[PDB]
Subunit: 115 residues, 4 copies
């Protein structure tokens, strides 16, 4: 898969498990079209969101439902979600890992783009 | 004023100056209405976006044009922008500083939320 | 003054108040000499650590006692502290803001380095 | 291995490869004793630093030579290194991933502590 999402929990020092992630592709009319989604695994990872064929150049938004995560942990979060918006560009580097490190009032996102 | 956006450049170790910031507020119809915009100053701060009166409860989106910022520095960054989406003032008015720390392939955003 | 330490709490979205900060400067004998210390104020800032005259070129270590901070909040954090080690003023005097953003198992530190 | 170090490069959006990492254990006299070291792999990872047997409770310092990394990339860095200092506590969670995300003037470190 050319796209992987990895979410870490900076409060618990753990993968952020069962975090809903939605991926959207910007449509011609500048709207976000749902493209894929999943929940992060026990390892805080979400694999298999897309395929090389499907994951064409375009602007993608990865929306990480951080709020539900924090709500599940009983911790007041600031953000509604973490939205990572990027242009996928052909095609090297090929693989995108979108890693998000979550704190209740802060998140960081990083892209590890590799071949 | 209750909403300040601060943008720092993690490559240069500097404020991120002249960064366009667009603030949107989720409307009743669940669309993003333009709320305010500006650009960061030499201090990487953007003040005066709104007022206590205008900054009512709502879901706000602060979209920081990090791409233009990096592009102006010759960098093709990963992100189109840094988007900070949050419910504001739901427990009464607060002063929000939305700080973004930018790197070409990473950004972090933090909110420092204090009482008026 | 040329060295400021700012500490933010990423859990609370607040300044990290009363955080002990110890600054050391690498001596000629390559040991860490105590340089300055203080604690962050209500704004999570620690000012007045040093002066232009005293803050000469050197390798400085800012050790932020994040553990005591979290522990006081009932949290057993991962890190003993956040340690920021850097060469200062090597291209002439600069004003350094060392910002740390703290979470129990993570911290980030940034330097905003500006001219006097 | 109970300890893994992972280093990412926030400028290039890549693993931070060939980054020297030194691990130290605080000795009884409060000095740092070198314990282990390595360079991060192509994946920005450093495995096999220690073993469960050797990695007893104590205060450890992971010193990531970020400066040499940035120097190799021709980018002026701020920090001499990134030092992650933590108490290893028995023994759950067992495995420590010390992840560092590097920028020239900023780094973040996170511990992902799992079983
Ligand atoms: O250097 C800074 C970095 C961050 C900051 C922002 C997001 C993630 C990590 C650090 O916030 C700051 C707030 C300030 O008032 C002053 C600062 O110098 C900083
Ligand atoms: O602990 C981690 C933190 C970040 C990470 C992500 C965004 C901002 C700062 C750190 O990325 C990771 C990627 C990995 O493959 C494994 C990890 O343990 C981490």
């Amino acid at each position: 898969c050319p796209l992987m999402v990895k979410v870490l929990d900076a409060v618990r020092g753990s993968p952020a498990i069962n975090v809903a992630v939605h991926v959207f592709r910007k449509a011609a009319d500048d709207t976000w079209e749902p493209f894929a989604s999943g929940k992060t695994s026990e390892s805080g990872e979400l694999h298999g969101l897309t395929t090389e064929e499907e994951f064409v150049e375009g602007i993608y938004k990865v929306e990480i439902d951080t709020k539900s995560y924090w709500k599940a942990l009983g911790i007041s979060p600031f953000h509604e979600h973490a939205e990572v918006v990027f242009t996928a560009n052909d095609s090297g580097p090929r693989r995108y890992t979108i890693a998000a490190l979550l704190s209740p009032y802060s998140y960081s996102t990083t892209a590890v783009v590799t071949n």
